[PDB]
């Protein structure tokens, strides 16, 4: 799953020019990549 306020940061709505906002958007992208990689390994375990 992807949270609210993490989907609001991926989809570039409420984009401010601040760096304290890009610092959060990067934090969201990293979590989404983590979760997608884990979900993909789950399919290799499920086969066994």
């Amino acid at each position: 799953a992807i949270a609210s306020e993490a989907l609001s940061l991926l989809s570039n709505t409420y984009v401010d020019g601040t760096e304290i906002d890009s610092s959060l958007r990067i934090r969201a992208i990293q979590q989404m990549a983590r979760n997608l990689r884990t979900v993909l390994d789950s399919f290799e375990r499920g086969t066994a």
Binding site: S4, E5, S8, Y14
Partner: protein, 353 residues
């Protein structure tokens, strides 16, 4: 998306700078409408003025006692669940959480005639039941607190009225989102009591519970979280409230026609026989049947509960959290629902049988 609603009000029975965001806010019908319904719905031999005095005494130390009349435009519109819970903090089974919440809101508020404000509101709510002016007709769901702005004695409130709770975006201190929450005492999950407890969708009800004996009226409201739909929730309430039902049914109110027709020998008068001279000598030729349905259990004398549906929680499993977190100066146990989608239609269902 969601649906926002905004309303200006006074700050007497509600202080938005203290209540948590996401808190359930109630609205109040005008007070001068209770007088009319009390003047007519009151049972016989019961003074309909106890409500009027308990009402004029509540508002006599609430705010400016002038401009409580008809066409002022400013009025104590809204309350919170915490206020209406702490005013009746002696009727919940969990005395610990009830008294914690009560002592939290007595000190964190103005403390200038705040104890009296809590006492007289409870007296008014009590008096509303012996006059059969039930509180569920004058209190209703407004929304979940989202955004506010305040001045000296004047507040302006924005709340989530319909739609998923976590989709509303605010400028809350830590993060831009907020989830619903309620005091731990008003919480009541019916599925754990009825041994259903299944995993699935739930509803969020707003149930009042009346208990009326002579001069011993007690009113409390809960927030129910059940699997049973709007129609089949009154059964689950009646099975859990089996004592108040029987107590109110008794302590609250304080013809062989099928046989006479089976023989043409009984006295009778066909419809074409009802004319001028037949008038006086008809009401005595027939069978006499005295008596009256006076002094019997009615719907307003046997009522013990009244509930609405205000939202649902459509998850695979309802994850609610009970944590102790403070209203500033005091700790108080709350409950943190997750993923409620507010609904409405504000349709109250009375329970008397």
């Amino acid at each position: 998306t969601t649906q926002l609603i905004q309303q200006v009000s006074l700050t007497d029975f509600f202080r938005p700078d203290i209540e948590h965001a996401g808190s359930i806010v109630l609205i109040l019908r005008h007070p001068s409408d209770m007088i009319g319904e009390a003047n007519t719905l009151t049972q016989a031999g019961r003074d309909p003025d106890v409500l009027l005095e308990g009402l004029r005494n509540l508002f006599n130390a609430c705010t400016a006692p002038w401009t409580v009349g008809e066409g002022g435009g400013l009025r104590a519109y809204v309350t919170s669940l915490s206020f209406i819970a702490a005013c009746r903090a002696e009727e919940y089974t969990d005395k610990q959480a009830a008294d914690a919440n009560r002592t939290a809101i007595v000190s964190a508020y103005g403390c200038s005639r705040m104890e009296t404000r809590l006492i007289r509101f409870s007296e008014c709510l009590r008096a509303m039941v012996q006059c059969h002016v039930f509180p569920h007709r004058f209190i209703s769901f407004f929304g979940s607190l989202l955004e506010y702005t305040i001045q000296d004695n004047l507040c302006n409130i924005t709340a989530v009225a319909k739609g998923p709770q976590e989709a509303a975006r605010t400028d809350k201190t830590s993060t831009r989102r907020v989830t619903a929450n309620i005091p731990a005492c008003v919480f009541w999950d019916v599925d754990k009591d009825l041994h259903l407890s299944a995993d699935g969708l739930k509803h969020v009800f707003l149930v009042f519970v009346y208990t009326q004996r002579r001069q011993r009226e007690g009113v409390r409201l809960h927030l129910a979280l059940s699997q049973l739909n709007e129609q089949c929730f009154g059964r689950g309430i009646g099975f859990l409230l089996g004592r108040i039902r029987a107590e109110n049914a008794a302590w609250g109110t304080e013809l062989p026609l099928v046989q006479l027709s089976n023989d043409p020998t009984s006295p009778r008068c066909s419809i074409g026989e009802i004319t001028g001279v037949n008038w006086n000598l008809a009401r005595q030729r027939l069978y006499q049947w005295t008596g009256d349905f006076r002094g019997l259990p009615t719907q307003l004398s046997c009522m013990y509960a009244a509930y609405t549906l205000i939202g649902t929680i459509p998850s695979e499993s309802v994850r609610y959290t009970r944590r102790m977190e403070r209203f500033g100066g005091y700790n108080v146990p709350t409950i943190w629902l997750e993923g409620v989608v507010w609904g409405g239609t504000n349709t109250w269902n009375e329970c008397y049988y």
